[PDB]
Symmetry: C2
Subunit: 384 residues, 2 copies
């Protein structure tokens, strides 16, 4: 039961830690329940049962996490469904000249070939649902139509209930604690500053401790880059809600600021790399810049956190100066090494000794990379 | 038409470049066509039409790229479908004590809540299809059963045709040019050596050209790490085909070798980083190690390519020595700088000058990181 105990503890911890999944699950349960309630109070027709099943399936499938995702993916699915329905109805109808079966059969092959071996396109590698639902639609609405004498006046029956299922699903999703995708993004870039600032401090404080907790930080910032633009397409389908004032909110710098920070985060990627290399500076030599490396590490962490705190407020008050102290700290490092830089060189007894400068040099290049980020924030904060 | 012309040119180029998508699309078209052929030669029952639509949908949905993916995801979908069917049938039946409707209605809420807010689990963030199809199954097989007096003897009707659709889909997928997922992996790790070896050579040859093509290489190796283990779960469901001799082929080192190379690829990540930093060594000083940096860059590229070529053959002949020359080349670099290492140091006029050692030091650390990779290959090549 200890494995089950651990699984239950993990579930409880993730539920208490993220009390948004429970809200979403309650919302989807409520949607399914209200649709079932509507179904279970009128059963005069087998077509009513069929349309009921269709409504349940739609409510299941068109319901996902964020508002923008729901709206945009629902619109894409509706476009694909309508297109496939039109195409299949056209081919069914105008496939009846005075051998029409093969002229309907082969059309499946031609349409089937195309979609399956076009969905595999590199650019359209994310809209897998849009093409698949198109292939499912055209196939079903054709076979159902082809088998039946006239599905024209019964196809509208199935479509109308799909709208009711979607109408219920969207209304509860949007009007009951709307988990947007816009403000979720804004909660992500503010997260990136904090979990890299500690990653910076972890690296420096880890380079001097002698005689992964830091891996999660910078890897998250690097590997999340494939995720904001996913939230980007989601966030553009949101109305002017919340503090956000007007239409077309500039969610183009929120990926610029994340991009600029990710550009800076490549050094702290390599900064952790030094403490992992198979060639490292000796202990006797590392603890001679303790006062030097620590101070710039602290100030860099202070600024990066402080800037990340600023985006949380989106400070319409105008900051006075940010990058003064960090510049002085790194400068002192560069002006201090030259006194002891003769402790670098005159195989391996010298490569290890030189492997100290490759850490200090990365740190100074980090500070240099820190200039563009405040430049990106400066423009974003004046047009947001 | 120029935009359409460019789209058509891109499609033609990707089709000719990758003549496997066309095979897959032809296979899916053939599967759909043969199922339609089977349907269109017997229509004595409306249930035949319904089951026909079910068969078409199954053939569409259970059909994907590789053999391992098809088999494993089909098994997972079958498990979920069977579980949901059993659960919903049990609740429908034993939900009839002598107000049974709410006792059926609420069960949807309880099961619905669970799955939707459990599918969101971090660990189970990839099996979205398995949970969703379970929720779709239990919902439909319940509502269809609940509406009908006795769906017990008609539910088996729908299930049997699903098997026929899958049976057709798998047979053509497996027996007509089987695009495995195992050998696809083996074609990926061999790809990683080539596109990093050029990335190495691009970086060094780019550090000296003065008075992205290299970005694609190392980023692919770094960002593919989330993809081999996806192929890993796919590749374990393959029978002993091809040259692969026996059951349970050791596809655990093919991620070790990819892992070991990716560990080495972090330096060439930072190696390209130096040529992008805002602080760089002056031109007058870079072109004094031209003979030094180039030779080790060439030998490192030679070995990394040569090792990657070895995995293509999976050389059962026993190599004599690999890492000799690269070690001598880097050693010469370290033994040559000390003559001119006094050209590093005695703010920015000195940080830029020191920014040369941070390039040579990374390169030597790269060579040091190159030892473990041949160690991983050594064990893999003796048990494969």
């Amino acid at each position: 039961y200890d494995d089950a105990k651990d699984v239950a503890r993990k579930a409880w911890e993730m539920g208490v830690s993220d009390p948004r999944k429970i809200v979403f699950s309650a919302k989807i349960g409520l949607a399914l329940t209200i649709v079932a309630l509507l179904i279970f109070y009128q059963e005069p027709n087998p077509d009513l049962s069929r349309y009921s099943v269709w409504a349940i399936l739609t409510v299941v499938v068109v319901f996902e996490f964020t508002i923008g995702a729901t709206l945009s993916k629902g619109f894409n699915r509706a476009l694909g469904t309508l297109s496939a329905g039109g195409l299949a109805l056209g081919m069914a109808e105008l496939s009846t000249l005075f051998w029409e079966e093969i002229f309907c059969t082969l059309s499946i092959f031609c349409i089937g070939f195309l979609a399956t071996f076009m969905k595999l396109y590199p650019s359209m590698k994310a809209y897998e649902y849009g093409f698949r639902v198109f292939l499912l639609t055209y196939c079903y609405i054709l076979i159902s139509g082809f088998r039946t004498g006239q599905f024209i006046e019964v196809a509208i029956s199935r479509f109308l209930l799909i709208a009711l299922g979607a109408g219920v699903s969207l209304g509860v999703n949007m009007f009951i604690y709307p988990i947007w995708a816009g403000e979720d993004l804004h909660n992500l870039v503010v997260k990136n500053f904090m979990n890299v600032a500690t990653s910076l401090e972890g690296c420096v404080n880890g380079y001097l401790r002698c005689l992964d907790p830091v891996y999660k930080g910078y890897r998250s910032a690097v590997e999340s880059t494939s995720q904001e633009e996913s939230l980007m397409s989601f966030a553009i389908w949101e109305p002017p809600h919340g503090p956000y004032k007007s239409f077309n909110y500039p969610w183009k710098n929120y990926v610029k600021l994340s991009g600029a920070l990710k550009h800076c985060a490549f050094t702290v990627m390599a900064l952790h790399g030094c403490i992992l290399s198979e060639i490292q500076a000796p202990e006797e030599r590392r603890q001679v810049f303790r006062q030097e490396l620590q101070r710039v590490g602290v100030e860099g962490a202070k600024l990066l956190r402080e800037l990340g705190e600023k985006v949380k407020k989106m400070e319409k008050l105008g900051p006075v100066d940010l990058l003064f102290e960090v510049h002085l700290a790194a400068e002192e490092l560069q002006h201090k090494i030259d006194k002891k830089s003769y402790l670098l060189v005159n195989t391996y007894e010298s490569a290890s000794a030189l492997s100290l400068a490759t850490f200090a040099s990365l740190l100074i290049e980090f500070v240099a990379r820190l200039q563009n980020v405040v430049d990106a924030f400066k423009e974003l904060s004046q047009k947001a």
